[PDB]
Design an enzyme around this catalytic site. Structure first.
Site, PDB file in Angstrom:
ATOM      1  N   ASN A  66      -8.542  10.121   0.537  1.00 57.33           N
ATOM      2  CA  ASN A  66      -9.121   9.401  -0.614  1.00 57.33           C
ATOM      3  C   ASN A  66      -8.567   8.025  -0.592  1.00 57.33           C
ATOM      4  O   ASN A  66      -7.352   7.825  -0.561  1.00 57.33           O
ATOM      5  CB  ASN A  66      -8.752  10.120  -1.940  1.00 57.33           C
ATOM      6  CG  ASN A  66      -9.533  11.372  -2.214  1.00 57.33           C
ATOM      7  OD1 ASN A  66     -10.634  11.435  -1.903  1.00 57.33           O
ATOM      8  ND2 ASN A  66      -8.801  12.362  -2.780  1.00 57.33           N
ATOM      9  N   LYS A 103      -1.255  -5.909   5.463  1.00 53.44           N
ATOM     10  CA  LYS A 103      -0.263  -6.169   4.416  1.00 53.44           C
ATOM     11  C   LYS A 103       1.084  -6.184   5.092  1.00 53.44           C
ATOM     12  O   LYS A 103       1.349  -5.469   6.102  1.00 53.44           O
ATOM     13  CB  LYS A 103      -0.306  -5.044   3.473  1.00 53.44           C
ATOM     14  CG  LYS A 103      -1.594  -4.973   2.681  1.00 53.44           C
ATOM     15  CD  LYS A 103      -1.705  -5.993   1.546  1.00 53.44           C
ATOM     16  CE  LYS A 103      -2.930  -5.839   0.734  1.00 53.44           C
ATOM     17  NZ  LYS A 103      -3.068  -6.907  -0.436  1.00 53.44           N
ATOM     18  N   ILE A 147      -4.040  -2.764  -2.677  1.00 57.63           N
ATOM     19  CA  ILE A 147      -4.655  -3.793  -3.483  1.00 57.63           C
ATOM     20  C   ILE A 147      -5.515  -4.640  -2.586  1.00 57.63           C
ATOM     21  O   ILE A 147      -5.035  -5.492  -1.824  1.00 57.63           O
ATOM     22  CB  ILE A 147      -3.479  -4.696  -4.069  1.00 57.63           C
ATOM     23  CG1 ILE A 147      -2.640  -3.870  -4.988  1.00 57.63           C
ATOM     24  CG2 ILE A 147      -4.097  -5.872  -4.869  1.00 57.63           C
ATOM     25  CD1 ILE A 147      -1.218  -4.491  -5.370  1.00 57.63           C
ATOM     26  N   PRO A 198       0.891  -1.267   0.000  1.00 57.34           N
ATOM     27  CA  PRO A 198       0.000   0.000   0.000  1.00 57.34           C
ATOM     28  C   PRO A 198       0.824   1.172   0.000  1.00 57.34           C
ATOM     29  O   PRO A 198       2.022   1.152   0.351  1.00 57.34           O
ATOM     30  CB  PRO A 198      -0.796  -0.151   1.217  1.00 57.34           C
ATOM     31  CG  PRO A 198      -0.941  -1.642   1.480  1.00 57.34           C
ATOM     32  CD  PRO A 198       0.490  -2.184   1.048  1.00 57.34           C
TER      33      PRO A 198
END
Lengths: 114, 114, 114
Positions: free
Chosen positions: A97, A32, A64, A1
């Protein structure tokens, strides 16, 4: 990420450790491995939020997977809490975001992850 | 909504008031109140357009809804018009990427809009 | 198309001519003119990758079309090879997010492409 923060707080106000704390806190929160966490902090920016130039931040978190309604609430609680505690930016002057990236659309190491 | 401008125009060529003009011109064309509008302007960048380093800009508008082809051409004429009258960048050296954000993917105030 | 690189390598380490090179290599790989290509490089950034400050980069390629499995694999070989030969960043410390933009979501010259 990957986590990006743009902020009008000055550079000398970002505490030592702040990137490493966002790395390890994001690896726990996203599940992750830390080896795939990238963090990017950009201070001293020219910004307004709600019409004023009081401390504020515009951020992005790309991952992801691990992106969705409850998880993103959790990330906002964690990340707005660190931006208030460490940078002294009020949560209601932070936007984040969130992007759920498809593996075929993230290049890394010369190839993509699909 | 959040509007970001990255440009190779130098800092001293970005007039005072330009972030308030984009705040109030976005709240009129998006219809969302200025409370929710954040604006971020980043001058002095190393960037080219069409290969050359004359004045240019790469921008992004993110909003929950209010994004579509015809709305985005209204925003493009208003924002290219402010970037040419204030910053003297030619509209054909400006790109604006528009993003319709799902509410669950926008964090604010320690939570999200879902 | 537009390609943006954010990296902690210093400004004096970027070859003067690297943006022109990326314009021309992204017009041969996307197959698009160099008139519509925009390139933006942001050095000296505060960033970490895997929690360390060794050279790294967070990048983005946006294009209307020309974005998909095969093409993103190809652009990841080309651009990871460029950032490693030119800026000496290891390909395992580069992320490139690829965005296939709808033509209606890209503003240019005071309008949009659809």
């Amino acid at each position: 990420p990957m986590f990006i923060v743009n902020t009008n707080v000055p550079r000398a106000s970002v505490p030592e450790g702040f990137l490493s704390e966002l790395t390890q806190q994001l690896a726990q929160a996203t599940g992750k491995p830390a080896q795939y966490i990238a963090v990017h902090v950009v201070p001293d920016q020219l910004m307004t939020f709600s019409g004023t130039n009081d401390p504020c931040a515009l951020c992005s978190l790309h991952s992801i997977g691990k992106i969705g309604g409850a998880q993103n609430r959790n990330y906002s609680k964690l990340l707005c809490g660190l931006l208030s505690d460490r940078l002294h930016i009020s949560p209601d002057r932070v936007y984040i975001n969130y992007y759920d990236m498809n593996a075929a659309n993230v290049g890394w190491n010369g190839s993509t992850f699909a």
